[PDB]
Design an enzyme around this catalytic site. Structure first.
Site, PDB file in Angstrom:
ATOM      1  N   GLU A 166       0.814  -1.204   0.000  1.00  0.00           N
ATOM      2  CA  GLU A 166       0.000   0.000   0.000  1.00  0.00           C
ATOM      3  C   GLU A 166       0.858   1.269   0.000  1.00  0.00           C
ATOM      4  OE1 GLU A 166      -3.397  -0.162   2.754  1.00  0.00           O
ATOM      5  OE2 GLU A 166      -4.140   1.762   2.014  1.00  0.00           O
ATOM      6  N   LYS A 173      -2.384  -2.006  -3.681  1.00  0.00           N
ATOM      7  CA  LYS A 173      -3.567  -1.390  -3.094  1.00  0.00           C
ATOM      8  C   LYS A 173      -3.351   0.121  -3.235  1.00  0.00           C
ATOM      9  CE  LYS A 173      -6.907  -1.587   0.628  1.00  0.00           C
ATOM     10  NZ  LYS A 173      -7.530  -2.437   1.708  1.00  0.00           N
TER      11      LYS A 173
END
Lengths: 303, 304
Positions: free
Chosen positions: A158, A197
């Site tokens: 992420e 992500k």
């Protein structure tokens, strides 16, 4: 300790199976605090018990769900909770085919905490840690991601999201993602057994958001990444669908599964349909099951 | 500061080069080199011998514009004229093909000029530190071309020193570069890559896999085309491998072509042997390898 073909096989099978057919990821891992406001919003109190309740309900929904949900992330807590009949939330999801995810959110104790986590039924981990800055969380990620793959886990890299214009946000995301993957290469990270992500380059209709999102994405994200599940973050369940649909429609090269990893856009409605009352599982499992399919179709553009 | 206007162009050109299984011809051999070539056909090295041979190539039937979408040229040659005082430069422009110059401080000045002349894309080839400087030079020049409306053919590097070995290296060297091109904000969509092929005995199957793998690990889906250099390979192998790589069961957001020299001129040059009597033969073998590789670019190629 470089991976062996076998470790890859495992990793690959998983990352690929968390999006196998458009199946997104569920964000049922909110913090003790976050869950608090979520539940609070619905005019309810934040208590451990009333959690296991809204979570037992979701993971109990018809097995058809494994047609829109390829994996679910959990906060530490939930990874151990037992449903009414003392059934592990863990196994309620595994049986039904969904994959167990665990918020690993300091790389100290990760190569150990992960090792365990895998044994405890987890197959993937989430974690989110100036030119200097940008390169920092990047080499960080790189290591944390390299660690998960050592403990048979599939890292969901992420890249932290940070009043300007879309074109602005687009340039930053690009500049960031480029450093993220560059760093990741530096650390010999099996991209195939990974997952991104990212955020949707947002402030501007979904098309314009998807045209600026994919673009910046394809100029940076390697084909070898099996899929990129987006994070809704501040987007209504109705806009986290519109956008993710256009994204899977934007007229550009898109070699990776353009999935989702939503929480607010997958629970919100199913969250109101409860309000403490644990008998309206229909309304709940209705509002949840309605979005999993819908956003499963955003991951297909057939929405 | 490229305008949405030049990106328009940079791309049109970037793609028009690798349209339908079309690749690039490297007739850009520098004098000394070209002589080594002619030397193998026992042909004296003359400004003319060069002019002729290359005249033959560029003079081949216009249907050559179905396999060759762009030809690179060496300085001298960009200004030579065919037997009838006509310009190869324009002979190629009119014949569909796009003209490309070999460029290798003063660069951005030269470009604009080569742009005025009809060239719409150029070339320039160059340890952890080393690779970094390489990566970054290849990126400065890159943005210098697009600054002057040319399509920069980014050429990485590598050394002849197994498969998984040449692979691992290729991926490093390729991350340095596309990362480089990003720090410099290079409109990737107005680019082209001339990678080597990741190559114990190896079958086009493997040699292609090891390669595409590495390619889809590092080279972005925004680059419109990867035109592999055949350096060292026989005309046949450059084709089996370009075909193979094109059939490899992996993701490939980008055209995987050829930017061949030895692999395209090899036979076409041996059949000529410097005897202007064989203009016929020569143009055949070229046309032959020219179409042959286009097929490999479509994976649609069969050996017998």
């Amino acid at each position: 300790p470089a991976l062996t073909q076998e470790q890859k096989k495992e990793l690959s099978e998983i990352a690929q199976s968390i999006v196998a057919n458009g199946k997104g990821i569920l964000a049922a891992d909110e913090s003790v605090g976050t869950m608090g406001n979520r539940l609070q919003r619905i005019k309810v109190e934040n208590t451990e018990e009333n959690r296991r309740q809204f979570r037992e309900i979701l993971f109990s929904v018809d097995s058809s769900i494994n047609q829109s949900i390829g994996g679910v992330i959990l906060f530490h807590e939930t990874l151990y909770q037992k449903d009414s009949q003392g059934k592990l939330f863990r196994n309620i999801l595994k049986e039904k085919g969904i994959v167990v995810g665990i918020k690993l959110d300091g790389l100290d104790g990760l190569s150990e905490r992960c090792a365990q986590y895998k044994k405890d039924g987890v197959d993937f981990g989430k974690w989110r840690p100036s030119s200097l800055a940008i390169q920092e969380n990047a080499n960080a990620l790189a290591r944390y991601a390299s660690i998960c793959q050592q403990n048979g886990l599939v890292p969901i890299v992420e890249p932290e999201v940070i009043d300007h214009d879309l074109e602005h946000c687009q340039y930053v995301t690009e500049k960031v993602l480029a450093a993220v993957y560059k760093a990741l290469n530096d650390h010999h990270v099996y991209l195939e057994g990974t997952l991104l992500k990212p955020n949707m380059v947002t402030a501007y209709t979904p098309e314009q958001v998807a045209m600026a999102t994919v673009t910046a994405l394809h100029r940076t994200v390697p084909a070898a990444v099996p899929g990129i599940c987006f994070l809704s973050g501040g987007m209504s369940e109705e806009d986290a669908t519109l956008n993710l649909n256009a994204i899977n429609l934007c007229p550009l090269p898109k070699p990776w599964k353009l999935s989702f990893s939503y929480g607010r856009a997958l629970q919100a409605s199913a969250l109101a349909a409860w309000g403490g009352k644990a008998a309206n599982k229909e309304a709940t499992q209705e509002a949840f099951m309605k979005r999993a399919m819908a956003n499963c179709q955003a991951a297909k553009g057939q929405y």
